[PDB]
Write an enzyme that holds these catalytic residues in place. Structure first.
Site, PDB file in Angstrom:
ATOM      1  N   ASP A  36     -15.168  -4.357   9.722  1.00 13.62           N
ATOM      2  CA  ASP A  36     -16.348  -3.749   8.933  1.00 13.62           C
ATOM      3  C   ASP A  36     -17.191  -5.029   7.969  1.00 13.62           C
ATOM      4  O   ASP A  36     -18.126  -4.423   7.605  1.00 13.62           O
ATOM      5  CB  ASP A  36     -16.304  -2.461   8.141  1.00 13.62           C
ATOM      6  CG  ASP A  36     -17.436  -1.480   8.085  1.00 13.62           C
ATOM      7  OD1 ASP A  36     -18.065  -1.226   9.011  1.00 13.62           O
ATOM      8  OD2 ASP A  36     -17.777  -0.948   7.151  1.00 13.62           O
TER       9      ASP A  36
ATOM     10  N   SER B 180     -11.784  11.319  -3.585  1.00  9.61           N
ATOM     11  CA  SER B 180     -11.201  10.884  -2.277  1.00  9.61           C
ATOM     12  C   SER B 180      -9.837  10.723  -2.062  1.00  9.61           C
ATOM     13  O   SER B 180      -9.158  10.932  -3.268  1.00  9.61           O
ATOM     14  CB  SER B 180     -11.927   9.626  -1.692  1.00  9.61           C
ATOM     15  OG  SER B 180     -11.657   8.527  -2.551  1.00  9.61           O
TER      16      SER B 180
ATOM     17  N   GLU C  25       0.686  -1.218  -0.092  1.00 12.05           N
ATOM     18  CA  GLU C  25      -0.090   0.059   0.045  1.00 12.05           C
ATOM     19  C   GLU C  25       0.976   1.193   0.043  1.00 12.05           C
ATOM     20  O   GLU C  25       0.497   2.063  -0.832  1.00 12.05           O
ATOM     21  CB  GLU C  25      -0.860   0.219   1.122  1.00 12.05           C
ATOM     22  CG  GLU C  25      -2.038  -0.849   1.264  1.00 12.05           C
ATOM     23  CD  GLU C  25      -2.981  -0.622   0.054  1.00 12.05           C
ATOM     24  OE1 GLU C  25      -3.022   0.152  -0.539  1.00 12.05           O
ATOM     25  OE2 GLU C  25      -3.964  -1.538  -0.059  1.00 12.05           O
TER      26      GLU C  25
ATOM     27  N   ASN D  11      -8.521   5.504   3.204  1.00  8.13           N
ATOM     28  CA  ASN D  11      -9.474   6.256   2.234  1.00  8.13           C
ATOM     29  C   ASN D  11     -10.388   7.238   2.971  1.00  8.13           C
ATOM     30  O   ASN D  11     -11.268   6.746   3.874  1.00  8.13           O
ATOM     31  CB  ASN D  11     -10.548   5.477   1.358  1.00  8.13           C
ATOM     32  CG  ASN D  11     -10.752   5.940   0.135  1.00  8.13           C
ATOM     33  OD1 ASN D  11     -11.943   6.608   0.217  1.00  8.13           O
ATOM     34  ND2 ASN D  11      -9.962   6.309  -0.735  1.00  8.13           N
TER      35      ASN D  11
ATOM     36  N   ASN E  27      -7.857   9.454  -5.410  1.00  6.88           N
ATOM     37  CA  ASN E  27      -8.726   8.414  -6.196  1.00  6.88           C
ATOM     38  C   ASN E  27      -9.743   9.310  -7.157  1.00  6.88           C
ATOM     39  O   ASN E  27     -10.036  10.593  -6.997  1.00  6.88           O
ATOM     40  CB  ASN E  27      -9.602   7.710  -5.212  1.00  6.88           C
ATOM     41  CG  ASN E  27      -8.762   6.965  -4.336  1.00  6.88           C
ATOM     42  OD1 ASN E  27      -9.114   6.992  -3.152  1.00  6.88           O
ATOM     43  ND2 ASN E  27      -8.009   6.108  -4.546  1.00  6.88           N
TER      44      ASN E  27
ATOM     45  N   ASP F  11      -6.116   8.683  -0.262  1.00  5.24           N
ATOM     46  CA  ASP F  11      -5.778   7.364   0.440  1.00  5.24           C
ATOM     47  C   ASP F  11      -4.462   8.021   1.437  1.00  5.24           C
ATOM     48  O   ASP F  11      -3.745   8.794   0.675  1.00  5.24           O
ATOM     49  CB  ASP F  11      -5.328   6.291  -0.105  1.00  5.24           C
ATOM     50  CG  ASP F  11      -6.543   6.157  -1.164  1.00  5.24           C
ATOM     51  OD1 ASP F  11      -7.532   5.803  -0.784  1.00  5.24           O
ATOM     52  OD2 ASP F  11      -6.169   5.760  -2.247  1.00  5.24           O
TER      53      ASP F  11
ATOM     54  N   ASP G  27     -12.697   9.383  -7.644  1.00  2.00           N
ATOM     55  CA  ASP G  27     -13.956  10.094  -6.933  1.00  2.00           C
ATOM     56  C   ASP G  27     -13.689  11.005  -6.318  1.00  2.00           C
ATOM     57  O   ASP G  27     -14.696  11.676  -5.536  1.00  2.00           O
ATOM     58  CB  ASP G  27     -14.850   8.871  -6.138  1.00  2.00           C
ATOM     59  CG  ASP G  27     -14.063   8.714  -5.013  1.00  2.00           C
ATOM     60  OD1 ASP G  27     -12.768   9.149  -4.711  1.00  2.00           O
ATOM     61  OD2 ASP G  27     -14.579   7.968  -4.088  1.00  2.00           O
TER      62      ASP G  27
END
Ligand SMILES: CC(=O)N[C@@H]1[C@@H](O)[C@H](O[C@@H]2O[C@H](CO)[C@@H](O[C@@H]3O[C@H](CO)[C@@H](O[C@@H]4O[C@H](CO)[C@@H](O)[C@H](O)[C@H]4NC(C)=O)[C@H](O)[C@H]3NC(C)=O)[C@H](O)[C@H]2NC(C)=O)[C@@H](CO)O[C@H]1O
Length: 129
Positions: free
Chosen positions: A101, A50, A35, A59, A46, A52, A48
């Site tokens: 989650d 957003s 990562e 995110n 990203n 990271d 959209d």
């Protein structure tokens, strides 16, 4: 800060990630490696809009507040910049909520594609834990 392999393993272990939610330490160090290449200051944008952040590339769409991801959530209740710190505490607490989650470590794309089902034990070879 760029961590050393074993250095990150120790901090992670210390912070209670070994077998957290059934994921051995190897899994966590592999994820961090792919990562961010063990760099707390890694950031990636990203499509959209957003972003990271940090060592676990968390995110802004869902987990933190960066003031520039309109109508996103802040599930870890922290500013995204807290995730860039030399101290991995915020990153680990947040990770713990993510992994619980429902999708487990599949939340991390580099884990899913490069760690899942590999011999993750290799990532902690030679570390004094
Ligand atoms: C291009 C690219 O892939 N870039 C990477 C980033 O996307 C990636 O960040 C990860 O982004 C995914 C994409 O959605 C995100 O996954 C979503 O996570 C939420 C929260 O858990 C999920 O919603 C939950 O669904 C479960 C099960 O369906 C429910 O039990 C629960 O009710 C839901 N919770 C909430 C709060 O809504 C989505 O299901 C899930 N979406 C998808 C498509 O899987 C990850 O959480 C992001 N991961 C992290 C660590 O932030 C980033 C990180 O590696 O990497 C970019 O390269």
């Amino acid at each position: 800060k760029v961590f050393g392999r074993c250095e990150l393993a120790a901090a992670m272990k210390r912070h209670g990630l070994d077998n957290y939610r059934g994921y051995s330490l190897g899994n966590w160090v592999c994820a961090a490696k792919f990562e961010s290449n063990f760099n707390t200051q890694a950031t990636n944008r990203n499509t959209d809009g957003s972003t990271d952040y940090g060592i676990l590339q968390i995110n802004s769409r869902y987990w933190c507040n960066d003031g520039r991801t309109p109508g996103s959530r802040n599930l870890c209740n922290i500013p995204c910049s807290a995730l860039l710190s030399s101290d991995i505490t915020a990153s680990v607490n947040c990770a713990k909520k993510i992994v619980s989650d429902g999708n487990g470590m599949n939340a991390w794309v580099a884990w899913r594609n490069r760690c899942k089902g590999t011999d993750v034990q290799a990532w902690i070879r030679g570390c004094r834990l």
